[PDB]
Amino acid sequence: MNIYRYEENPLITPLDVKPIHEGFEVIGAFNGGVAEYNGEVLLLLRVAEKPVSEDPEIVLAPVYNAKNKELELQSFRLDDENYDFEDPRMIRSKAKLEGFSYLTSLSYIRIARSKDGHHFTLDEKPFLYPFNEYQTFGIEDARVTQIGDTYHVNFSAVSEFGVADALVTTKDFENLEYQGNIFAPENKDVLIFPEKINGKYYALHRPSLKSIGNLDIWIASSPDLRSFGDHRHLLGIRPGEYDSGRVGGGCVPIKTEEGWLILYHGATEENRYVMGAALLDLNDPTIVLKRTKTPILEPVADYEKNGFFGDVVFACGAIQEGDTLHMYYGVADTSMAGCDMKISEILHQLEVE
Amino acid sequence: MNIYRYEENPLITPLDVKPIHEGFEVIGAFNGGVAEYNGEVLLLLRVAEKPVSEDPEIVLAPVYNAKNKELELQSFRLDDENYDFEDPRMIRSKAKLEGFSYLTSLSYIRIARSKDGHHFTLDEKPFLYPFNEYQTFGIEDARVTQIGDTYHVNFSAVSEFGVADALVTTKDFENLEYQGNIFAPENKDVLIFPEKINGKYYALHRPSLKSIGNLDIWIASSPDLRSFGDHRHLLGIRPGEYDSGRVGGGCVPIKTEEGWLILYHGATEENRYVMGAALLDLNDPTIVLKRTKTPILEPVADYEKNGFFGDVVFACGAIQEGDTLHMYYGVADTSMAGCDMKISEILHQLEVE
Ligand SMILES: OC[C@H]1O[C@@H](O[C@H]2[C@@H](O)[C@H](O)[C@@H](CO)O[C@H]2O)[C@@H](O)[C@@H](O)[C@@H]1O
Numbered sequence: 001m002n003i004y005r006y007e008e009n010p011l012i013t014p015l016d017v018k019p020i021h022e023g024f025e026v027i028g029a030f031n032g033g034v035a036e037y038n039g040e041v042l043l044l045l046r047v048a049e050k051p052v053s054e055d056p057e058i059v060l061a062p063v064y065n066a067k068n069k070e071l072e073l074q075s076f077r078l079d080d081e082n083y084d085f086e087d088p089r090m091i092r093s094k095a096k097l098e099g100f101s102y103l104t105s106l107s108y109i110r111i112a113r114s115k116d117g118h119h120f121t122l123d124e125k126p127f128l129y130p131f132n133e134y135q136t137f138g139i140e141d142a143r144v145t146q147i148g149d150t151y152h153v154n155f156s157a158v159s160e161f162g163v164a165d166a167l168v169t170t171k172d173f174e175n176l177e178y179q180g181n182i183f184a185p186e187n188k189d190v191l192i193f194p195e196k197i198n199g200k201y202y203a204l205h206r207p208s209l210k211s212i213g214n215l216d217i218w219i220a221s222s223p224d225l226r227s228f229g230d231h232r233h234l235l236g237i238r239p240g241e242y243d244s245g246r247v248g249g250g251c252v253p254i255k256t257e258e259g260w261l262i263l264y265h266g267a268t269e270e271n272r273y274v275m276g277a278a279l280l281d282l283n284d285p286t287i288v289l290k291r292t293k294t295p296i297l298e299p300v301a302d303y304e305k306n307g308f309f310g311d312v313v314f315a316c317g318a319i320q321e322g323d324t325l326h327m328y329y330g331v332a333d334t335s336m337a338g339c340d341m342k343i344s345e346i347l348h349q350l351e352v353e
Numbered sequence: 354m355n356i357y358r359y360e361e362n363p364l365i366t367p368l369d370v371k372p373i374h375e376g377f378e379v380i381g382a383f384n385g386g387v388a389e390y391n392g393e394v395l396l397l398l399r400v401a402e403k404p405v406s407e408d409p410e411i412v413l414a415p416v417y418n419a420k421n422k423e424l425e426l427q428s429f430r431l432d433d434e435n436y437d438f439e440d441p442r443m444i445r446s447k448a449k450l451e452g453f454s455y456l457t458s459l460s461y462i463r464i465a466r467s468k469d470g471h472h473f474t475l476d477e478k479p480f481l482y483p484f485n486e487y488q489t490f491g492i493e494d495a496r497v498t499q500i501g502d503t504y505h506v507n508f509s510a511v512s513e514f515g516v517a518d519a520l521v522t523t524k525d526f527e528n529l530e531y532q533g534n535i536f537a538p539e540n541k542d543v544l545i546f547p548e549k550i551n552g553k554y555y556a557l558h559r560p561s562l563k564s565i566g567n568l569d570i571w572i573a574s575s576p577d578l579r580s581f582g583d584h585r586h587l588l589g590i591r592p593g594e595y596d597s598g599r600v601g602g603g604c605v606p607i608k609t610e611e612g613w614l615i616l617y618h619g620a621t622e623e624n625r626y627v628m629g630a631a632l633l634d635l636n637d638p639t640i641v642l643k644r645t646k647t648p649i650l651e652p653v654a655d656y657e658k659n660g661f662f663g664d665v666v667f668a669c670g671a672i673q674e675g676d677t678l679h680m681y682y683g684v685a686d687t688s689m690a691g692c693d694m695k696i697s698e699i700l701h702q703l704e705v706e
């Protein structure tokens with residue numbers, strides 16, 4: 001691929017963003033959902049804030065109390081032999097290193113808008129902030145699918161009940177309608193297809209499985225974009241490849257003449273994240289036609305390789321302008337970057353590989 | 354309360370059922386779904402067959418290969434230092450004790466029918482046998498909800514992709530229609546409510562969660578009993594109590610003047626299973642009104658205590674006859690038993706506790 005990485009990269013960094021919580025630091029502004037509205041590019045940024053502990057032997061978990069509608073910080077000692085603090089994103093029990101007891105930060109969604117796609121201005125206030133008992137550890141990684149005049153904004157809802165995926169709909173980014181947890185825990189990386197397809201709506205999703213099964217992309221159909229069923233396995237991990245550890249939905253499916261083009265992320269077990277592509281049948285998106293054998297975007301620039309969680313590119317949306325895709329991606333779980341690519345080149349790579 | 358355990362218990366044992374796979378033994382006929390059809394009680398038995406190995410140092414896992422439509426057997430040495438065989442239901446990686454690599458048996462569904470509710474006769478052939486790539490490790494624990502003339506038969510579908518819940522509909526138990534995986538993995542113990550409730554159908558379900566969340570009962574709504582949404586947390590585990598390790602739905606919700614009566618199973622962390630009860634609001638079954646503090650049925654008969662996996666009662670369905678519930682339950686993951694209880698007495702226990 002001939003990727004054009006934007007000269008202004010990284011576009012938006014934690015320095016650009018002031019914390020909304022007293023005594024917290026912004027540790028990322030990343031993984032932003034992408035929409036066009038009223039002549040501007042909107043990035044629905046995930047902003048992660050972490051409390052600063054006065055004592056460096058203590059870390060705090062920033063948990064939202066749904067009954068009181070405020071944070072209630074929970075403290076943990078670094079030397080507590082019950083807990084493992086080696087993954088900077090979470091507090092883990094040593095007996096459950098496959099999961100977490102708490103996250104180290106709390107996320108919410110805040111919009112940034114651009115007229116030229118390159119220079120962004122933040123909206124004054126947050127857009128979505130934890131509002132119920134399914135979001136007590138944060139709202140994360142908001143995706144946006146526009147169908148007609150309606151924007152479907154769906155996001156990870158993290159709490160003690162699990163990691164679910166929930167939906168808000170809106171025609172203007174001001175008047176919001178909550179549509180509930182559209183996928184049960186454990187799920188995330190939900191991408192709603194941008195039109196009805198032979199009588200059904202579809203969404204990619206990504207169950208995380210305790211007993212058996214890998215971290216694989218699934219698809220579901222829907223009559224109404226509120227209820228989903230007919231769940232099917234779609235894209236699996238591949239041992240020895242860039243997506244040996246996990247795969248998940250990235251950008252919204254892109255209609256091409258050759259099929260639905262899926263720009264998904266893949267990671268190894270070492271947690272290096274890249275973007276790959278797949279192509280699904282136009283008329284029945286449950287059928288996979290081609291998949292890349294090498295990535296379309298990987299961490300190579302310094303901003304991609306270095307940050308809060310290094311060696312990550314994580315694209316949550318893109319805007320098509322003919323053959324050109326303006327892709328926006330989180331980098332290193334820290335900042336937002338932008339690049340342009342050609343859809344025809346992605347298709348070509350699919351064909352070749 | 355007082356429980357009328359049938360004099361004929363256990364009603365159906367592995368001794369009553371011949372294996373359909375050469376070189377296998379029936380290890381359980383259990384956890385049967387319950388329906389009334391054409392003047393008879395139908396039990397949709399889970400029949401688990403285990404491949405027998407003449408070498409005691411070796412065990413075998415039965416896998417249905419969805420391409421050849423044939424059983425393949427995977428062998429293991431019991432002294433393999435990478436696997437754990439201590440749970441007789443499963444073959445586990447020592448690095449993943451919270452899950453499984455294989456099961457020790459393969460299940461399918463076979464109908465038994467009765468005129469009197471006590472004496473049963475097996476149908477000649479199986480009813481549902483693994484038929485797709487979601488069912489390679491078996492079809493388990495069929496629940497049946499009858500709405501008008503249509504029987505909704507929904508069951509665990511176990512494979513290398515995860516443990517999903519799938520649905521077949523029928524008006525006659527002869528012509529079957531497959532409706533897909535109505536719940537994505539990891540889920541099971543799905544109980545469809547027996548009527549439309551203020552404009553929506555409902556089902557109990559039970560996400561199993563890798564990262565965070567306990568093994569808790571959830572609820573979802575649906576427009577058509579094919580797709581489900583608006584997932585909500587319903588009944589959680591209680592540390593220190595009979596349901597400290599997990600809860601899941603048992604029988605189909607029973608309409609009472611006081612609300613939807615839910616006969617659920619609970620287990621401790623030591624895997625002792627009992628039945629409990631809860632009461633949901635009649636008009637909004639997302640609201641829990643009452644729950645038992647002590648069980649309504651425990652494993653105390655010899656056939657409940659001793660067998661393939663001892664100290665289990667697991668009721669998957671009941672027939673209502675006025676105030677009497679004729680409840681049928683798996684015992685020790687081995688056999689089927691029946692008892693009669695009274696709806697009014699369970700409601701009374703709910704009120705008292
Ligand atoms: O950190 C890489 C990548 O990992 C996943 O999210 C992680 C973290 O951000 C999140 O807070 C928790 C809980 O949902 O799950 C971690 O696995 C991605 O979904 C993405 O958000 C991260 O960029």
Ligand SMILES: OC[C@H]1O[C@@H](O[C@H]2[C@@H](O)[C@H](O)[C@@H](CO)O[C@H]2O)[C@@H](O)[C@@H](O)[C@@H]1O
Pocket residue numbers: 384442456493494509511516541662665667683686
């Ligand atoms: O064994 C008790 C109880 O446990 C659950 O099922 C177990 C087993 O039968 C099943 O084969 C695997 C895979 O689905 O999960 C085990 O946990 C219950 O659902 C029930 O079937 C058993 O009676």
